[PDB]
Structure formats: C-alpha cells, structure tokens
C-alpha cells in the first residue's frame, strides 16, 4: 500500500467529501469545503520503456470518501495495493522435460481470461527538412505506389487513427528530391521501352520495422509557421505516430516470482493436457522442483502453501519481514481449507476415489501419512503438508505421488521475445570498415568475435570461417557475387581480400609504415587492384 | 599528436571537451582497435538471434527455428525457390512480395521448407569458452518467435532457460555446409575434447526419472 | 546423426579429408546437374513435398550416400584438373 501511495501514480482524495463525477477521463470531487475539484486521469500514456501508464477510477458517483481515500488506481495497482503480476494456481512437478532447466509451462486458460496481457506503445518519428536539392514534403502522394499501399493514409500522408499497421506498412508518407546522377545505358533503354519519364522525387516514407506493428492510437504533427511551435534550424515539419499493441503471454516470454525463481515460457498446453485437481480444476503454471534445492529459496514453497490455504478459504494474508506466519498457523489454515476442499465433496454424496486410494497407498509407502488411518484422515495429513492428489489430464491416471499445489504470485518481466527476435540477410554496412552494423534498430548483423573465431578454428572449419571473414562481411565484390550466385542458383564464388585489411594497410601507411603483400617469389601483389598507385 | 596522441604529454582535445582525440595508434591497437574489433573478428551477414526454449521432442541433431527468422536468413535461397515455383515472375518480384508482411501467402512457407531441406544452421551462445560453444543443428521450422534447443547440449553451452539468448548462422557454400554437417554437428560431438569424458549426457529430470 | 558417419570416418585417415571429398563431390553434382551420379534410381534420396516424393535438392546428402556406396574413388594426384573437368564436360554437358 505504502509503495503505491508514495509512488504518486495512484490518485487519492485530498480531504473528506463526496464524489460528484466519475468518468474514464476524469473524476470530480466535492469536498467538505464546498469547493469542486476536478482530477483529470492519465489514459494510455507511453512510459520511457514503452509500458502503458494509465489510471482507472475505483469509485462511483455520489460515493462518500474520506481524507486520503483512494479515488483512482494507478498502473500496476489493485485497490491501492501493489500489483506487479497475477495470482496463479501452480503445481510443483516435472512435465515431459518441458520444465527442463528452469523452463516454465503455462495453461492456455491464462490467455483465455487475458492473464499476463500487457499494453505497450512505441513512438515513431520522421522529419521533413529543407535540402539544397529542394524541400522534403510529407504527403499522401508517393511515387510508384498502389492504392492498396496508401489506403490508411489521410490527405496529408499521415496514417489514420485506429488503423492496424503491420511490418512494411507506411506510417508517415514522405518524398525527398533525388540526388543528381547519370542513368546507366540500361536505364536509358528501359526508359525508352516503357516510354515513362523518371520521377524527380524518391520515396523516403517512414515504414514499420520487422517484428513490430499494432493499432495507431495517436498522431501529432508540428509544422513551420504555425502558432506555438518552432523546430531546429532547417527542419520544416515533424510528425509523431504512436502505435500501441496488446501483448498476450507467449512462448519465450519471461516470468519470475519475488523469491528469485525465474524462467521462460517454453510450452503452452491446452487445458485438457494440464494436470488437474480431482474436482476438475486445472492448474495454471507448472514449476520444476529441481530449481529449489540448489537455489535454496524456500519462500516460494511457503507462499505456495499459504497460497493454497488462501485459495480455498478465499482470503489474502500479510506476512511481515522476519516476523511472519510460521508453520503451525499455516497448518491450521490448511486444515480449515481442507474442510472446504473435502467436506463439500462428502456432503455432495461422493466418497474417496480408487486412484486416490492407490496414491494414498504409495504415500504411506513413502512415510508421508500414518498407516491405519482413514483415507480422509490421510488426505488431510497430506494436505497439511501442502500436497494434494493430482490427475494427469492426458491419461486420466493420477500422479504416483502427492504433489505441492497452491497459489503463487508470478510477474511478467520486461524481457519479451517479440522485442528480442531479430534476423538479417543483407543490410546497412559501416562507413570505414564496410562491415555490417550492430543492433536490431539499425537492422544490424550479429558480431562474430574472437572467441567464436577460436571455436571455428578448433572445429577445423576453414571455409565457414572464411565465409565469416569475407563473404558475409567486408568483402564487397565477394558479397555482391555471393548474393548474385545464390539468387541465380549458382554456388558461391571464391572470396576476395577483406576491406578492413586494406584499411589497415592504408592506416599503417599513414603511420609511415610500408606494408607489402608478397607472393612466393617475394614479388609485390596488388590488393588495391590497379587503383592505389600512379 | 597525429601519430600517437596522449603518448607524450597531455592529450589534445576538441574545444569544450575532455575527450582525447583519436589518433592512428588508438585506431590500430586496443579492444576497440582495428585488429581485435575488425580483423580477428567481424560482424556478419546471414545471422540472427533469439531467446531459447527447451525442445524435448527434438532429436539430438535438431533445433527449433522460427519461420520468420528462417525466411530472413535464407532469403536469397527463398527468392530463387520462389522463382523456380510459379510464385513469382522473377527474383525482384519475389523480394517486392517479401517486403510487405501481409503480402506473404502460404505457398512460400512450403517453399521455405523445400529450401532448408537437409541443410543445417549454427547455434552460438556467449561466452563461447570452447568449440562446443558453437554447434550445428538441422532446423525444424516452428511457429513462434523462440529458438528451440535440445536439452542434452545445454551442458556444453552452459545454457539454461532463464532468458538466455542464442545466435544463428547460415553456412553458405557446399564446403561450409559439409564442414557443419560432418565436423560441427551436435550428434557427432558427444565427448569432451578436454577430459575425453561424455559431454552430451543425461542430466536433471532425466537422471531423476531413471 | 548423419547415416553411416562412423563408416565414413572409417574410409579416411582424417575427417577433414572426408569433408573435402564430400564437398567437392557435391560441387561436381551441382555443376553437372546430378546426371553424373553413381546412384541407382531406387537408391536416389527422396524428399516429401505436398505433391509427393521428389528428388532431394541437397547435394551433400547425395555425395555422402554415394561415398557410402563405395563406387566413388578419392585420393591425391589421381588426374590433372583440366583433363578431369573436360572429360566430365564431355560425358555430362552443361
């Protein structure tokens, strides 16, 4: 509560009073003073990390509120309490190796009821500026484009609010005056064949990058010569387009609890495959027990037990640091919960199951329950240990032993596959080195570093290594010929001298050092190919 | 200063800055120097990266490879195949078709299945401490944005699924492909080059069950 | 694991020589369009499409299987390069 309160994200009432108005956009409060105060609410605003900060009203019109009482909930908060995630029904058990090495299995039911769904907004920007070749213009008129491509653009060339954009789609249309050049003879012949003059302007439109896209929620345009706005020198106009997306939990997303247990979602099973309680209730998350003993975080286990107790008693708990609920009390709560979990069934006119009997047999074989007691008493003894009978949804047969099941608090972290997935065939290269750029944002290639080279050397893979050092990097003729060969179905040609070596040679020349490539006869070999000597 | 700045006396800096100017010597030497940055290693084409996920159903020589990632990595091959099949008049049209994500039909995925047939890709995880830091796998196209890794190789990579990421590389030539399939294949490297003991072996849950 | 990899390693004193033989043979097959194969119509590697069984596009698989048959001869200085290339272009044009 205190964290949310000091956070300032959430909204509270200044003094005692009565609520005059409640809206999605605003809340109006009439205090004791008689003064009418209106509090506007922040709706779907984009944070620095692209998470959506938004406030929702928790009060109704005419409600009597006191001083410091909650009016609106901020982001990641529930009724004034910190909500960093969701409360899920978790079972601790291995599952077909899908739980292997901290991996996590989740139920599709989570997606069905929109658990772990998050709103994210990305900001796109493009400038139209004055050039010595003429002004850049933001327009719907873009050369060589079909009406299909310009569909969602307004008169001015900006995408319409509410439109769905996918990778490749135009957000803001822009044309730039083509730099002067002489058309190749091929272009002359082509131009003559089609009888169509080459257009003056080129398509510089801002487009959606790979892996992104969503719904356009906002558009902002700032021109030159309009009241209240002034851009940097040379810049005519700036347009911003805000695109938001609803992200459902998926395979590769990262989950974690407050005890340091973290793992990525590797498998989402249909509800029928999920392990389930005898009364038909399926679990949400399956966590591997192998993660506990080596990590020595037992807090998640107790949270699971107390979470079970709270799940059946329909209540929540506050366990303070170092002075909290201890084992006996949790056992008591587990008994009170067992009364509801079992007594209900017995009242419904149902007795113990055969498979429950078998599981109980194996359980007393494990020394978990005391031999000679009734099945109900033994089930209670197991329930006090935080373990329950669990049925395999595939077979219908139970798990051969009692398994820990309960409510756990699990958070969805900022690391999501959608953001991190990236791939590149060919693309932008660096100025000096002529090697591919870095980072997803520049559409860059991966860095093959010293140690990777060491690996390739250790494999004795010489042609692969040579590919890495030449055709896939700074060998220009090599990469061109390679691409052409691959698209022509031909095998790739012999690679040439990497450009960074030529750069090295010239930089060594700048330091007054003469580097000469020699043949077996010690005669000079020109790696500059007729270009660098008079 | 031009040859080696900072070498003798206070380094000359640009006005309104404490940052020493970068001389030829600085360009040549160091972690960011020409040798270590651009010569003994390079950034490369036909490469990718993603989060890893356990793949119990996979065979030892297989890995899960996202369809979109494969579409990008094998893009030229896919263009050629789209030219062979009637999907596109020529390579240029195929590329123009791949540019927009909504223009992608279902036959090109089949074409992509045809392209990667028998070929393998390389998986890498940092830090790459030994030669098994890079391994070869026969890719099996899967829906989703995650790369699927076989459990048994997790030890050699020191890989786990708490959010670890891996890089993918495509060997282009017949020679490179041969090297990858024969020398670099995961199933062909089962023993440690250090101790001679088995590296790819049952662990964790497997051991538990057995 | 690649089929008969142990036996393939058996045929050579060095794994890298196996790799070179396979790669070069694959280059031959690609260059001459598979019509120089030592395989029999029933030994031909197959690939399942939507249509049905078709010829395997992968030349490395072909080369490895061919090598496994034993009908291929590999070594050093078996024949001058030009003579080999020209006789191959005579037997199997392009």
């Amino acid at each position: 509560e205190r964290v949310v309160r000091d956070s300032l994200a959430a909204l509270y009432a200044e003094e005692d009073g009565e609520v005059a108005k409640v809206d999605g956009n605003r809340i109006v409060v009439r205090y004791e003073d008689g003064r009418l105060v209106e509090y506007p609410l922040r709706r779907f605003y984009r944070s620095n990390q692209g998470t959506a900060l938004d406030q929702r009203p928790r009060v109704v019109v005419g409600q009597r509120v006191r001083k410091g009482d909650l009016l609106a909930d901020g982001p990641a908060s529930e009724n004034g309490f910190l909500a960093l995630g969701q409360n899920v029904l978790v079972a601790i058990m291995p599952f077909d190796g899908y739980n292997f090495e901290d991996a996590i299995v989740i139920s599709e039911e989570l997606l069905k009821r929109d658990f772990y769904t998050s709103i994210h907004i990305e900001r796109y920007e493009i400038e139209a500026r004055d050039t010595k070749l003429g002004p850049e213009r933001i327009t719907r008129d873009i050369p060589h484009l079909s009406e299909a491509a310009l569909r969602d653009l307004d008169e001015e060339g900006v995408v319409r609010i509410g439109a769905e954009v996918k990778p490749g789609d135009i957000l803001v249309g822009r044309t730039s005056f083509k730099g002067e050049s002489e058309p190749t003879p091929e272009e002359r012949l082509l131009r003559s064949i089609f009888g169509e003059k080459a257009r003056d302007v080129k398509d510089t439109s801002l487009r959606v990058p790979p892996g992104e896209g969503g719904i356009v929620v906002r558009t902002v345009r700032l021109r030159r010569g309009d009241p209240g706005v002034e851009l940097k020198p040379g810049v005519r106009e700036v347009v911003r387009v805000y695109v938001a997306q609803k992200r459902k939990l998926q395979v590769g997303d990262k989950l974690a609890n407050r005890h340091g247990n973290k793992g990525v979602v590797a498998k989402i099973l249909p509800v029928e495959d999920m392990p389930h309680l005898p009364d038909g209730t399926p679990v949400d998350v399956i966590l591997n027990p192998l993660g506990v003993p080596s990590r020595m975080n037992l807090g998640q286990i107790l949270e699971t037990h107390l979470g079970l107790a709270g799940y059946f008693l329909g209540q929540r708990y506050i366990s303070p640091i170092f002075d909290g609920a201890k084992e006996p009390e949790i056992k008591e709560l587990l008994a009170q919960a067992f009364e509801v979990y079992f007594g209900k069934r017995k009242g419904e006119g149902f007795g113990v199951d055969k498979r429950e009997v078998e599981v109980l047999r194996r359980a007393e074989k494990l020394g978990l329950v005391t031999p000679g007691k009734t099945p109900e008493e033994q089930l209670k003894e197991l329930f006090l240990q935080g373990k329950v009978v669990l049925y395999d949804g595939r077979t219908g047969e139970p798990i051969e032993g009692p398994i820990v099941v309960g409510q756990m608090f699990i958070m969805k972290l900022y690391h999501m596959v959608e953001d991190k997935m990236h791939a590149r065939s060919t693309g932008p290269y660096s100025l000096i080195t002529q090697q591919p750029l870095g980072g997803k944002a520049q559409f860059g290639g991966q860095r093959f570093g010293e140690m990777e080279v060491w690996a390739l050397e250790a494999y004795g893979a010489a042609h692969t290594l040579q590919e890495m050092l030449t055709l896939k990097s700074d060998d220009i003729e090599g990469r061109n010929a390679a691409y052409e060969a691959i698209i022509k179905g031909e095998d790739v040609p012999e690679p040439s001298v990497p450009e960074s070596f030529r750069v090295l040679v010239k930089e060594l020349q700048a330091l007054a050092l003469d580097v000469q490539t020699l043949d077996e006869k010690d005669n000079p070999v020109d790696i500059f190919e007729g270009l660098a000597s008079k | 200063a031009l040859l080696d700045n900072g070498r003798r006396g206070a380094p000359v800096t640009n006005p309104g800055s404490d940052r020493p100017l970068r001389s030829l010597t600085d360009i040549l030497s160091g972690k960011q120097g020409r040798f270590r940055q651009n010569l003994l290693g390079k950034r490369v084409d036909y490469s990718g990266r993603s989060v890893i996920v356990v793949g119990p159903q996979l065979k030892l020589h297989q890995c899960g490879l996202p369809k979109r990632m494969a579409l990008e990595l094998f893009k030229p091959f896919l263009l050629k195949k789209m030219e062979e099949k009637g999907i596109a008049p020529n390579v240029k049209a195929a590329r123009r078709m791949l540019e927009r994500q909504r223009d992608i039909k279902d036959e090109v995925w089949d074409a992509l299945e045809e392209v990667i047939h028998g070929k393998v890709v390389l998986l890498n995880r940092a830090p790459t401490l030994h030669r098994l830091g890079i391994q070869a796998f026969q890719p099996v196209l899967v829906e989703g944005q995650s790369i699927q890794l076989h459990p048994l190789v997790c030890e050699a990579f020191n890989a786990d699924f708490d959010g670890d990421q891996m890089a993918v590389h495509v060997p282009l030539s017949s020679f490179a492909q041969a090297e990858a399939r024969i020398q670099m294949l995961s199933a062909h490297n089962l023993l440690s080059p250090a101790s001679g003991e088995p590296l790819a072996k049952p662990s964790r849950d497997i051991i538990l069950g057995l | 694991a690649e089929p008969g990899i142990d036996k393939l390693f058996g045929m050579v004193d060095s794994k890298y020589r196996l790799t070179v033989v396979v790669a070069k043979r694959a280059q031959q097959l690609l260059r001459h369009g598979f019509k120089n194969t030592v395989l029999e119509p029933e030994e031909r590697p197959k690939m399942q499409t939507l249509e049905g069984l078709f010829d395997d596009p992968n030349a490395v698989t072909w080369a490895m299987k061919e090598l496994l048959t034993g009908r291929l001869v590999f070594g050093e200085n078996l024949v001058p390069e030009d003579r080999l290339q020209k006789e191959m272009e005579r037997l199997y044009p392009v």
Binding site: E457, G460 | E179 | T19, V20
Partner: peptide, 30 residues
C-alpha cells in the same frame, strides 16, 4: 592452415568410376 584448409587433405580429388575409366582410356590412347 587447419582442418579442411590443411595442405594435407586440401588437394584430395574425387572421381566416379565411369569418368575415371574414360580418362584412363583417353590417356592410354595417347
């Protein structure tokens, strides 16, 4: 100068028996 790049295995030639025999006849008749 290692692996497939080592001078030891690098120059290794491959030839099918049909073409090999053809070449042999070509060299015999000269």
């Amino acid at each position: 100068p290692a692996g497939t790049g080592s001078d030891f295995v690098r120059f290794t030639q491959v030839v099918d028996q049909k073409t090999l025999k053809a070449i042999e006849e070509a060299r015999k008749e000269a």
